[PDB]
């Protein structure tokens, strides 16, 4: 599966969302 | 010397750290010089 | 030598008493005074350096004062092997060298 | 924390001659320890001679035996030899070795050698 990374600007703010597609996180807030 | 054979003086602390072949980035400036420097396999950011 | 101390002194066991030095402002006033003790066909052996200081190996029960051209050894807690001579011993900037007093034959009694 | 070693040994020579007094040291080395000696008399006191000099860098020499007494240092193999020379009837007597700090500021001998008698 793909692993894309959700950010708002890093100026804004260091926090992430990693999204992992095509794989339930059963798997591997 | 007779301290009322004989070594150690000062006090020594340092640090050692191992290198790893990994992926970096490396801002350089108007000068030349490397300023930021963010990892590959760090985390997702 | 020039140094001032009687040949002889006697005293009880395990009491207190001191040992004295009798100098000059050229040899005591100026420069530091160290003690020795030797027994009968042995080796001179430091007891004090400077009378303040005490090398390894010697008890704490020695002590040492300077007063002017006066230099005194405190010797505290004598015990029976304790009878030896104690040298009395300084720098000399007159003769520039190292000078020793007569010796101090203690007797403990 | 050091072991010094014989000066000499057992010496005797006829009048007329001249002997050397090869101070050993071990633990330590020669070039960090200040040399000294010890004229000492069978039934007589003390009678500093040789040392080497805190200030000055320099290897000293008793002012009364001056000329007559003369020193040189080996430090690899760390033998300090003092010679004698114009032998006379009172020399003979225990020479010991003995040694300050080698900084500066050291009037002690702590550690020494047990001496060496001669013969005149």
């Known amino acids: 599966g793909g692993v894309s990374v959700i950010t708002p600007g890093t100026n804004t703010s260091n926090q992430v969302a990693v999204l992992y597609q095509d794989v339930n996180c059963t798997e591997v807030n | 010397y007779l301290t009322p054979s004989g070594w150690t003086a000062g006090a020594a602390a340092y640090y050692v750290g191992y290198l790893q072949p990994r992926t970096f980035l490396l801002k350089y400036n108007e000068n030349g010089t490397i300023t930021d420097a963010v990892d590959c396999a760090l985390d997702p950011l | 030598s020039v140094l001032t101390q009687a040949p002889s002194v006697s005293g009880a066991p395990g009491q207190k008493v001191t040992i004295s030095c009798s100098g000059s402002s050229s040899n005591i006033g100026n420069n530091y005074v160290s003690w020795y003790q030797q027994l009968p066909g042995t080796a001179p052996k430091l007891l004090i350096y400077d009378n303040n200081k005490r090398p390894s190996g010697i008890p704490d029960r020695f002590s040492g004062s300077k007063s002017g051209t006066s230099a005194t050894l405190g010797i505290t807690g004598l015990q029976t092997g304790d009878e030896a001579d104690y040298y009395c011993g300084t720098w000399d900037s007159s003769l520039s060298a190292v000078v020793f007093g007569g010796g101090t034959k203690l007797t403990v009694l | 924390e050091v072991q010094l070693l014989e000066q000499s040994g057992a010496e005797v020579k006829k009048p007329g001659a001249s002997v050397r007094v090869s101070c050993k040291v071990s633990g330590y080395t020669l070039p960090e320890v200040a040399m000294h000696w010890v004229r000492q008399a069978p039934g007589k006191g003390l009678e500093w001679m040789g040392g080497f000099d805190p200030e000055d860098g320099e290897t000293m020499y008793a002012q009364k035996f001056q000329g007559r007494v003369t020193m040189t240092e080996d430090t690899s193999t760390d033998t300090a030899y003092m010679e004698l020379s114009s032998l006379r009837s009172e020399d003979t007597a225990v020479y010991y070795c003995?040694?300050?700090?080698?900084?500066?500021?050291?009037?002690?001998?702590?550690?020494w050698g047990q001496g060496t008698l001669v013969t005149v």
């Open positions: 003995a040694t300050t700090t080698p900084f500066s500021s050291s009037y002690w001998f702590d550690p």
